[PDB]
Design an enzyme around this catalytic site. Structure first.
Site, PDB file in Angstrom:
ATOM      1  CG  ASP A  15       0.933   2.746   0.660  1.00 26.06           C
ATOM      2  OD1 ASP A  15       1.692   3.454   0.227  1.00 26.06           O
ATOM      3  OD2 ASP A  15       0.808   1.761   0.352  1.00 26.06           O
ATOM      4  NE  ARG A  29       3.407   1.386   2.768  1.00 23.27           N
ATOM      5  CZ  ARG A  29       2.370   0.751   2.883  1.00 23.27           C
ATOM      6  NH1 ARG A  29       1.477   1.199   3.786  1.00 23.27           N
ATOM      7  NH2 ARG A  29       2.124  -0.351   2.519  1.00 23.27           N
ATOM      8  CG  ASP A  34       0.050  -2.901  -0.568  1.00 21.63           C
ATOM      9  OD1 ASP A  34       0.954  -2.004  -0.814  1.00 21.63           O
ATOM     10  OD2 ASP A  34       0.293  -3.881  -1.113  1.00 21.63           O
ATOM     11  CB  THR A  35      -2.465   2.392  -2.045  1.00 26.88           C
ATOM     12  OG1 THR A  35      -1.087   2.922  -1.797  1.00 26.88           O
ATOM     13  CG2 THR A  35      -3.544   2.714  -1.160  1.00 26.88           C
ATOM     14  CD  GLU A  37       4.346   1.130  -5.176  1.00 26.56           C
ATOM     15  OE1 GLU A  37       4.856   2.233  -5.472  1.00 26.56           O
ATOM     16  OE2 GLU A  37       4.274   0.688  -3.797  1.00 26.56           O
ATOM     17  NE  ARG A  75       8.114   3.587   4.108  1.00 22.81           N
ATOM     18  CZ  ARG A  75       7.569   2.795   3.424  1.00 22.81           C
ATOM     19  NH1 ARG A  75       7.125   3.081   2.055  1.00 22.81           N
ATOM     20  NH2 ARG A  75       7.351   1.413   3.519  1.00 22.81           N
TER      21      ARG A  75
HETATM   22  C1  LIG Z   1       3.023  -0.767   6.364  1.00 22.78           C
HETATM   23  C2  LIG Z   1       4.567  -1.182   6.819  1.00 22.78           C
HETATM   24  C3  LIG Z   1       5.408  -1.592   5.546  1.00 22.78           C
HETATM   25  N1  LIG Z   1       6.606  -1.887   6.196  1.00 22.78           N
HETATM   26  C4  LIG Z   1       7.500  -2.080   5.005  1.00 22.78           C
HETATM   27  C5  LIG Z   1       7.321  -3.853   4.672  1.00 22.78           C
HETATM   28  C6  LIG Z   1       8.013  -3.884   3.405  1.00 22.78           C
HETATM   29  O1  LIG Z   1       9.302  -4.102   3.178  1.00 22.78           O
HETATM   30  P1  LIG Z   1      10.164  -4.248   1.782  1.00 22.78           P
HETATM   31  O2  LIG Z   1      10.369  -3.061   1.325  1.00 22.78           O
HETATM   32  O3  LIG Z   1      11.307  -5.000   2.595  1.00 22.78           O
HETATM   33  O4  LIG Z   1       9.340  -5.057   0.948  1.00 22.78           O
HETATM   34  C7  LIG Z   1       7.585  -2.204   2.835  1.00 22.78           C
HETATM   35  C8  LIG Z   1       6.338  -2.124   2.259  1.00 22.78           C
HETATM   36  O5  LIG Z   1       6.209  -0.678   1.801  1.00 22.78           O
HETATM   37  P2  LIG Z   1       5.507  -0.198   0.519  1.00 22.78           P
HETATM   38  O6  LIG Z   1       4.080  -1.018   0.274  1.00 22.78           O
HETATM   39  O7  LIG Z   1       5.365   1.360   0.550  1.00 22.78           O
HETATM   40  O8  LIG Z   1       6.409  -0.645  -0.399  1.00 22.78           O
HETATM   41  O9  LIG Z   1       7.549  -1.405   4.245  1.00 22.78           O
HETATM   42  C9  LIG Z   1       7.065  -2.331   7.404  1.00 22.78           C
HETATM   43  O10 LIG Z   1       7.893  -2.769   8.053  1.00 22.78           O
HETATM   44  N2  LIG Z   1       5.989  -2.068   8.595  1.00 22.78           N
HETATM   45  C10 LIG Z   1       4.584  -1.477   8.097  1.00 22.78           C
HETATM   46  O11 LIG Z   1       3.823  -1.487   9.066  1.00 22.78           O
HETATM   47 CA   LIG Z   2       1.945   0.450  -1.822  1.00 25.16          CA
END
Ligand SMILES: Cc1cn([C@H]2C[C@H](OP(=O)(O)O)[C@@H](COP(=O)(O)O)O2)c(=O)[nH]c1=O
Ligand SMILES: [Ca+2]
Length: 129
Positions: A15, A29, A34-35, A37, A75
């Site tokens: 993702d 992103r 949510d994929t 890891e 991102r």
């Molecule tokens: C998909 C997405 C993730 N995120 C943030 C929330 C999560 O915060 P935290 O890192 O604080 O948990 C993180 C999840 O990404 P990953 O799933 O790539 O880890 O990215 C956003 O803020 N907005 C979005 O639309």
């Molecule tokens: Ca992920």
């Protein structure tokens, strides 16, 4: 919402993907996805799916939603398309992502992805097996 051009710099995982957008390198992103890891179950399969989708594509497009375009990690947040096919929605269809991180300014393709997830579930694909 409107599509904008971009070019693959590199596959990263299920993702996230590195693209050149308006001349600048940028980790994108995937909205609404949510994929797992890489080191989790179906992580390799999610990375592989996204990779082939973007690497085979002749044309990559980025579509921002109505709200936040960058997350707190810098991102880019978007829907990505590979020869007109939505990567975000296609992962969900194959049971390689869950619908997730659905926040209010950025949920335009929510019902569409939910529909795909229901159908991945019915078929008990990958994550739903
Ligand atoms: C998909 C997405 C993730 N995120 C943030 C929330 C999560 O915060 P935290 O890192 O604080 O948990 C993180 C999840 O990404 P990953 O799933 O790539 O880890 O990215 C956003 O803020 N907005 C979005 O639309
Ligand atoms: Ca992920």
């Amino acid at each position: 919402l409107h599509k904008e051009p971009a070019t693959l710099i590199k596959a990263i995982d299920g993702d996230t993907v590195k693209l050149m957008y308006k001349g600048q390198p940028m980790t994108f992103r995937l909205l609404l996805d949510d994929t797992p890891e890489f080191n989790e179950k179906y992580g390799p399969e999610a990375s592989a799916f996204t990779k082939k989708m973007v690497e085979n594509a002749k044309k990559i497009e980025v579509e921002f939603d109505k709200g936040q375009r960058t997350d707190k990690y810098g991102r880019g947040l978007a829907y990505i398309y590979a020869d007109g096919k939505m990567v975000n929605e296609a992962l969900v269809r194959q049971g390689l992502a869950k619908v997730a991180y659905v926040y209010k300014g950025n949920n335009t393709h929510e019902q569409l992805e939910r529909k795909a997830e229901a159908q991945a579930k019915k078929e008990k694909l990958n994550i739903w097996s």
